[PDB]
Symmetry: C3
Subunit: 137 residues, 3 copies
C-alpha cells in the first residue's frame, strides 16, 4: 500500500504507483511507474478490483473493466486518460475488434493516443484483452 | 504537451487513435500496417510488398512528425509468420542505418485486416 | 564491430549504440540497446548463450535465466542496470508456465518493480520460449 519507495539515477527517479481502485500488483511488477514526466503502466487486465476475479460477461464487459483499471492507475499516477500518448491493445480475437473499439472510444477523445493492436494466443488468466499505456504527467 | 500527426501521405486514422503523437522530443507511432494510403486497401503481394508499404507508411508518419527513420530508437515488429523473418529483415535493413534501432520481433496470431506485418516505432525529434 | 562511436544527432539529442560481447551479438539491422537522453531502450532479449551463439540447453527456467542475464549485461554496458528498469514486456510461448518465469524474474528486480506487460505469442525467434525487452533510465 505504501508508495514512498523510489530508485534514484542521477537527477531522475523511479517512483511507484499503487492504488486500491485497481487490481493489486502481486509479485515483481508495479501497476505503473513514474519517471521524469513519463508514466508507464503495466498491461491492465479485466479483473474487478473489489473481488480479485475476472469480471463476468464477454469482450465488452472485459474491455470496460480494463479501461476503468487503466483510468484509475493513470489518475493515481497524477496523469489521466487524456494524457495517454501510446497504447498497445493485446486481444484474444481480432475479429471482434469493433466491439473493443466501441468501448475504447468512450474512454478517449481528441487527441487520441497512438496505438498498436495485435491478436495474441493467450493472456494472463485467460482474459480476452490487455491494454498498457504510456502517458505524460 | 501533446501533438497529433495527421498526414495525407499515410492511411488516415479512422477511429479512436492517431497516426503518431509527439510529446516533447519523443514521437510514438501507431503500429503501421501495409495499407496503401491512395486506395485504403492492403497492397498486393506477399510479405515483401507488405513490409515495404508498412515502412513507407512509417517513414511518412515519422517525417510528418518532424522526425525521420534515422531518428528511430526502438521498433516492434509483429509478424504473422516467423519463417518469413529473413525477408522482412532484408526489406527492413533498407530503411535504417547504423546505429540501428533497438528491436523486438514476435509472431502473432492475427493482425488488423488480416495483414502479415505491423511495425511501431519510438523516435526522437 | 565492437566500436560504439557512431551516433545519430537530432538537434541537441543523440542516439548512441550499446554493444557488449557479454550478450548475444546484434547481427543485422538492430542494436542490443540504444541510449537517448536519460533513457535506455533494449532489444527483446532471447535465451541465446553469448558464448555459443545458440539457444541455451534446458527448459523454461534456463531460458528465463539466460534472457535476464542477457538483459542485465546489455543494460550494464549502457551505464544502466536492472535496478533502473521502468518497463518490461515479457513475450512467452506458454502462459501456463508463467509462475516459473515469474520466480526467476523476481530475482532480478527490486522495489519499486518495473511496470510490466506479459502476453503469450504464437512464436518467437528460433522457437525460444521467452523474450523480454526493457525501457530503463541511465
Amino acid at each position: 500500500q505504501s508508495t514512498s519507495l523510489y530508485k534514484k539515477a542521477g537527477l531522475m527517479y523511479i517512483e511507484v504507483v499503487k492504488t486500491n481502485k485497481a487490481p493489486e500488483a502481486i509479485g515483481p511488477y508495479s501497476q505503473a511507474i513514474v519517471t521524469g514526466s513519463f508514466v508507464y503502466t503495466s498491461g491492465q487486465i479485466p479483473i474487478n478490483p473489489q473481488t480479485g476475479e475476472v469480471v463476468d460477461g464477454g469482450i465488452e464487459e472485459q474491455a470496460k473493466q480494463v479501461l476503468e483499471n487503466l483510468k484509475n492507475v493513470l489518475e493515481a499516477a497524477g496523469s489521466s486518460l487524456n494524457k495517454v500518448v501510446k497504447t498497445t491493445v493485446f486481444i484474444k480475437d481480432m475479429d471482434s475488434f469493433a466491439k473493443v473499439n466501441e468501448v475504447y472510444a468512450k474512454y478517449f477523445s481528441e487527441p487520441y493516443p497512438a496505438r498498436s493492436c495485435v491478436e495474441v494466443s493467450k493472456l494472463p488468466k485467460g482474459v480476452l484483452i490487455e491494454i498498457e499505456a504510456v502517458a505524460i504527467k
